[PDB]
Write a protein that binds this DNA or RNA. Sequence first.
RNA 1: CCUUCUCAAACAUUCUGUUUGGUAGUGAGUGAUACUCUUUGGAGUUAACUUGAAAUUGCUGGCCUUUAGGCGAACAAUGUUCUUAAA
Length: 43
Amino acid sequence: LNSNPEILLRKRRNADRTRIERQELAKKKREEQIKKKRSNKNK
RNA sequence: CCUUCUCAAACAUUCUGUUUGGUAGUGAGUGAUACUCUUUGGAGUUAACUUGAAAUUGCUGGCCUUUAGGCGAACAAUGUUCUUAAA
């Protein structure tokens, strides 16, 4: 039926949720690093 | 649980020489000979000696600028501030 062969890449699964999770993880890591940095002045 | 001002000129050629400037210390304790000044209260100097980087309380020196600094610096000057020496 007059077709043309090609290669197709399927969409990655759960990319947006992974992106949001990574953004949240980065924010949490920054915040906890700040917490521990200013918590070490009372040693 | 840091690590100490390790040099600059000017003149002259005798593979170098002369001159000038640059150096603020652990504390405590013995100990004379002498000098200068003095507000006569002690202030600055002058041999030498002891020591685990030792230790049991010296009333408060003076002038200037303040809100601790200068006298070794006057329309001059003061650390708790760097944080990958992190966790």
